[model samples]
Target: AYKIDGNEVIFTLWAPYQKSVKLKVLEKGLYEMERDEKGYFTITLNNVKVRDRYKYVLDDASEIPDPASRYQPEGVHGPSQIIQESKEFNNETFLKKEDLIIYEIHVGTFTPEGTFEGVIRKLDYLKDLGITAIEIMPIAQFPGKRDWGYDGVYLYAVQNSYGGPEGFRKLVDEAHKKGLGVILDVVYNHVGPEGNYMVKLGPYFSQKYKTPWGLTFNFDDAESDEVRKFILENVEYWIKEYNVDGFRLSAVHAIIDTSPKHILEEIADVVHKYNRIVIAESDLNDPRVVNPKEKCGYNIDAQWVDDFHHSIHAYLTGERQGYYTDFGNLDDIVKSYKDVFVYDGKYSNFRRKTHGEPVGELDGCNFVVYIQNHDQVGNRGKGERIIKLVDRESYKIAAALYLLSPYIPMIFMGEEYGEENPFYFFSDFSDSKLIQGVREGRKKENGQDTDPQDESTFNASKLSWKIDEEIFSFYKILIKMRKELSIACDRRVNVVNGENWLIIKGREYFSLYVFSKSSIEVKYSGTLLLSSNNSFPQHIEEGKYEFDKGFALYK
Candidate 1:
């Protein structure tokens, strides 16, 4: 924690082991630090203003950045810079849980400029698109530059490449003015491989459990309280300093903690006290992640539901390669619509065992659903979106189902317009050995040939912003219909499955999706609110009406 009183700056560090430590300033001489009985080292400097770069020198004379550094201007390896926020952000009004329509964006790729200022310029465009909030893929300081943000090591420092901490403050203030809430995607499961010095400061990791990235965090082991405090304070820092609306926890299933109260619960409790939310990305399919704490759960606000996306994608494209093997039938889609998890207490052909439990008494809005996201699109062999896999008619039907479902909807960067650009997995790793390892791992995992470290790979992932007007208009109209009808608000969704068609009945309206090769008849008696085909009637009768391969909404 830091305190700025008058012209003096107070700096503190939690290093329990080292006997002697010195503060190394960029231009000034080294100053010795005083240690307390609790192993806390601190020093108060007079006339030390903002923009000054400093690092800590341990007994061995090795210099490292501050563990809770606010801004790393030079880079992660360089000395941490002091950034005293001059302006107070006025953001009392924020987005609530029910009104959030998330637009997931990568700051570097969202605009051609590839900076926080670039995102600020597009606020009007996003607000006009009916987006209520924007979920920025992590901006924490990483090793080099461009990445998917899962390899972030410096949890407190904003990426210098994306304009530093001050740039982010401006972005947040501007977003609040434009009525767009900002949610930062944070990585706490494992630290990056390079430039990680937390192990030197304390026991930040445990080898008892392993994550795909590296060793799991030490949450229940020795000196675990300090590690937990480091993470908890980071969450508090973002919300209190940057004014972020909430956070999207990345790969929470990889965080193994057997403490009396799980780390997830502690995080949720802290964030909720500030009137913010915590959303998790988990594959566990357990309701405890989002259930209330009194119910013996984590008390998180919401979770990303991958089952819905896979079910819709597998049914439309007929691709059953990997995890898609368990979801290619119409019944799976129906089950997802009714129960939210098709594998809830049922045997799965893919896992060879029963998987997941039913989500009991939780509002469907507690789960977020989408047809296309970063993983579903970028993890593919060629990073092809659903637009390339299905025809325009089929794509529209899937869009209708996703937006009109009884769960929070998230749209990928360019999925609404059927953009041609692909979202590939690209990184900017300087180490040749790490680059070679990533290339080999991707080849072994998908059997596809692509370089994740190439400069051209990153350029190929940038959006061209060239959109198909017809498809764009279709999505806009569907979003308008969703808001007007309040279709998914009641949480009383009913699904009727036919041979090659499905009908989703809501409180006041119903959606029909016909997937047959020939025209299929649907009996309905209401005004035809919207249709994919141009020849459909505006008014429907109680008698059967033949429909081709497309989607229709009646109210």
Candidate 2:
């Protein structure tokens, strides 16, 4: 909806099936709409201005908000507001793939206010954290104001409770001011269950295939041009309106599209024009994700690799249940340093089949390594952090291995300071049956009675803001070393191991880690750059030396 000359406004609604449509303005009275053969209804009012709120009354009986509303002043159940605010932000270009050090955060739990302005207040901290960008969870308008943002119904509107459109603009503006980019995680596979009016308006979802959360989007099915356009336009909307740096699309594997030109390819094509990036939270370890379009691939710039985390986490913590069944090998740990995917073309006991193909010559920048992310932690029964499962020294070693590895690195919000709070899956949906269904499922799976709709659940997830200076200082030093040593620029990483020790030899530096209880003796001719344990290093002689436990860095 656009306001002409700041006085007249054009109210548009796409209702292909409805024969009658009424525009019910808040205080401007109800008026009949004119429908076109293309299934769109339009009405022009000369006296109305922006900031006006209205609802479309279908057939003079059904009333609902705009499916593409930009601002939901009330909750998802209320009217849509025509908000047009302009702001001139400073120049902020997209950083290179290797230059990205991403920090992921859920805006709702990142601050006490749980709003966009709350994130603005913490911009300085993010800038000082040595990360080039912050990847925020979805902010689309969901019900009741609090959610993981994955369950959003309105694809265009910012969550009303999270300061709506204006608040998000200010947050992005401030992030640019502080020289930190913002990446938004969006859901395109399925819409949320409640407050969804698109199903009645058009064929937005495919009836053929069903997603785990809901119906799959109609990307290739019948009458899908407008449905696809709705999403593609949404991609441009965030770039043009909110000025997001990039996008981390949720679960591309779950999206079922059998078209010649995939929706992912089209989305990436549009985004690349703005010099932005597209990252995939892909589950399939197939190299096609990052492969070029000429290779019949999606051309995602980078993708999250969980094999590194699963191998390291399972090895250090001795975990063997669930997906960890495919991990826990020392060789697997060594392989992840060079080959990002461990189960590539190998039989996976978890999947009961051979899975994935190796990216033989893919650039190292396409791989993103992390010790722990939101899914690896939050999807667990208790949302336990890595520090909760392994020792503090081992945690620091985990940090060192990935931070100093040959791939791009991402950090979960509180992982820098070693915060101990568990990030449970919490929500504030208004439906009782859905809330109860989640509670029962969690209890059945994990033997816990935690309620997703409980206010305490959301409160329990807020950042403790309790900083561990030692851990914080350690992280700062490693990040600084990463840039100074040109870690991401170094792609030739060699991970060799003996019976009880492992060596990560890179172009610039080499690191040694121990696995046995006793001491390991080694003869080296290089300077000891850093030590995870102070009890091991006191000399730089070109002779045999003994070190026990932890890890050490050398050149």
Candidate 3:
């Protein structure tokens, strides 16, 4: 990494193991670095400038990119380019976390162009669609241009494939202008296998822990203080430089830390200082992760509730494999409404053990509920959206179920309008052995197999952007009703359920639903706001009103 002050540039490298290090600037002569007792290598130069590409020559043997690289103009294997100063832009300053209506998007597949600027073009559409926030998947520098971005090696560098830092800044600025908050997905659980030169530089990864995807980050090992510093500084960099409103920490369950101050707690503490929230994709149903530091917890703002999705999907689709075996009861959905976790201290048939604790006094705002996310959809053998898994009416109910809940609601990119594209686990790694290993792993995971390294797999995941007029109208109206009535943010609600019907009663709005095949008569009177089926009249009279077999929101 280089610190520039006008014409002078000070390049620094933290390589404790290497005996000697050299700074190699492209089109310039290599220079030996001055090493200190602390294992830091430094070189001061006068002619270095922005856009100048450089690499570290370790002990005159091998070359590698800077560990704290600002930009990877080439692929991760190539030299790191000095980043131009990020231009300041107007940010709308989204402070409210509870009212956030998150729409999850994969940058590479969200649009035809698949760039940050390409995503900027749809800001107006998202704003009009009633999405308060757009939660983007990881954009950190990975092995190649086409990737899901979880395999990010350079944590600090912006992905050159996604139009780099400048393009990302423009998207964030434009999103703020449209009153849309941008929440970036950040992976800190592991370092990617390919282009992992940072490992050679220092103890960035640990042998103490093993992770499913790649090498576990050295969060609690020796020299872990700097590891924590590396991550904390990245969080600040995003908030200060890119003006991102929030973060979705990827697979936090894999982040192992035994330090007195956990890495997650440190991240939350740092991000909260800037008034931004950090949500985690926590597989472990541990409330301690989301609870406040005062309660001897991690102080995380919120967590992605997989149990909510599992129960809803299992019940609707009747899939009883893997984690879904623990769900499928109608009571699961009802319980998910009353409490955020359906499996709260219950015996899990899938885990073969008891799992989860009650979300005891936690505000519904502290749980993010969704029927479909990238993980749930992409983890399947053949990546299938919920709309494809269930009937059209069931799909509508699933969307309405989460959208109307008090918890923060997130919908995947095509889920809003029922886009038919299946989001597969695709990537573009240059190594043949790595590609073969990924293919084999996917095959073993699913009875079926598709090449993750295939270009066609990535292309198929791209959203068609074709609006299903009917489904779009349904989603748009549901989203509009959520914000207009302020229904989702209101948490003091009651859930009443029978054998085949369910009712959600809030202070100002009550939603009635009949999940059975036949129609049912319902009591009470109000103006019919929106419904899954539009065959009935807009207004309903008092006392046992005859309702269709769908759902209706009333006020």
Candidate 4:
């Protein structure tokens, strides 16, 4: 409980199992908080403003950081920091749901320096590329200097190695100044097993519901209210404190909530009230996710459309391994373009059953479609990028189609510049045991011989600042088209032809996309837009262009 009088804020924290709780303010003397019969500690402090770092000291031992801290100055296992809540922040001003062109990036490897400030230098580059929004691959203070940010322990803190809270603020401020919205990826399903100290302080996790990562958050149990409040408060804090545009919920399908009012639904309701965007990374492929809660749904704004991505990947690359075995046919691609859900009531061989409900009556804007994301790139056997595996023609075709597709398009950091560097999963946990475990896990999944323990995991993934001439030209062409051609962003695209080849007709003003599997001369009487094949000039009439062929506008 808290009460305010003038500049003084008085508060009490209850911990029945603990004897003493000392208030530790940064650069200030340790203030002893008085404990009462009900195991409650009371403290009164004046002039408590934003960014005035504070933590709690339990018993006579060293101080313990706030389990519900808004910002961690140190790493996951370090102390919390106070931030002066910015007066300039207005949640309503964030990029709207319909206008997002997300560029997903991992902070550590996004630059050579691998710091927040390093990313600031590239803000203008992203903005110039027509990216309206940017999604930082989870920044929550994980166990080490580098991790996916999914295995986060400090839920409120930005990673200390990424320049902590101050650096994050600068990045956001810089991005906003350049008219780019920032979306922070958050993991609420489970805290990483490494450096998780929440259990020592409270019943933050439940054993009944288990997540693949670790114990699940208890969102349905008796004492679940506190845990739920902790997450909700964190959401509000990010929007109000850090001025984030939106949230990309990681693995929301794994979250188990059986209450009459599900936690996810409640979160959506609360988030919508604040007019902030909430997108879920769900495997369920349900369109109801984007529908309103009144319609008996999760009511998220958008979802990561994996079905669309899988369909496109299979159609282009014909390599059917693992989940790809379920795809590779043009039917899925056609269905994905039309309905956004490929598995809707379809007989799935992998599941050995008919899976997923129909994504009925949903617009293309309800999903985010992409060819290469962090998971698709980094989770492979050797962590190979799409460009490394596919030919240049196929790569350019994928980029053109993705950017011009109806659904919101997202590009991984280096995809624009045809970055040759592979985005491998890397981590720098201090504990040898945990480090070895992570390395072994990656090896088992990708291949038994691949060593994730190598320092190259961090070194290899850095985005090269120098741009390749050909690759840079390809990206520049795409960006120029996005700005110059209205059809590039058109959602009401029509599939004029869909056989062994595909003819995607944009608006009458823009060119029709003709994708062919084999070399054939396509006759069209219009100004030639751009061709994926360098062999084919602006005027295609007499020559044959080989496999992985495509072209933009035609009058």
Candidate number of the best lDDT: 3
The weakest ten consecutive residues by lDDT in model 3 span 86-95
Candidate number that wins on lDDT, 2 or 3:
3
* Per-residue C-alpha lDDT of model 4 across residues 359-438, encoded as one tens digit per residue: 77666667888988899988886678788876776687778777767788888988888888877777767778877887
TM-score against truth, every candidate: 0.96, 0.95, 0.96, 0.89
Candidate 2 stretches with Cα past 4 Å from truth are 1-7, 87-92, 445-448, 518-524, 538-544
Clashing pairs in 4: 50-83, 50-84, 51-82, 51-83, 51-84, 511-553, 511-554, 526-555
lDDT of 3 at 2: 78
Q: Give me candidate 2's TM-score against the actual structure.
A: 0.95
- Give one digit per residue, the lDDT tens place, for model 2 in 79-145: 9988875624323355777888889989889989988888899888878879999999999899896
Q: Give the residue spans of candidate 3 off by over 4 A.
A: 87-92, 518-523, 545-547
lDDT of 3 at 496: 73
Residue-wise C-alpha lDDT for candidate 1, range 1-555, written one tens digit per residue: 456777888988878768888988889879898898767789999967788889999978999998788888877788998887553533443787776678999988888988899999989988888878899999889877778887787899999999989789999989998999999999889988777777777678886888877887889988889889989988888988889989999988888789999999999987887888789998888888998977888999899989999999999999999999999999988888888888888888888888888998788778899998888988886888899999988999999998988888898988878887878787777777878887887777755466878777778888888988888888888887887888643579777777889978788788889886444445556788888887667877666556678888988
Q: Which 10-residue window in model 2 sums to the lowest lDDT?
A: 85-94
What is the Cα-based lDDT of residue 282 in candidate 1?
Answer: 87
What local lDDT does model 1 show for residue 519? 46
Clashes of each: 0, 0, 0, 8
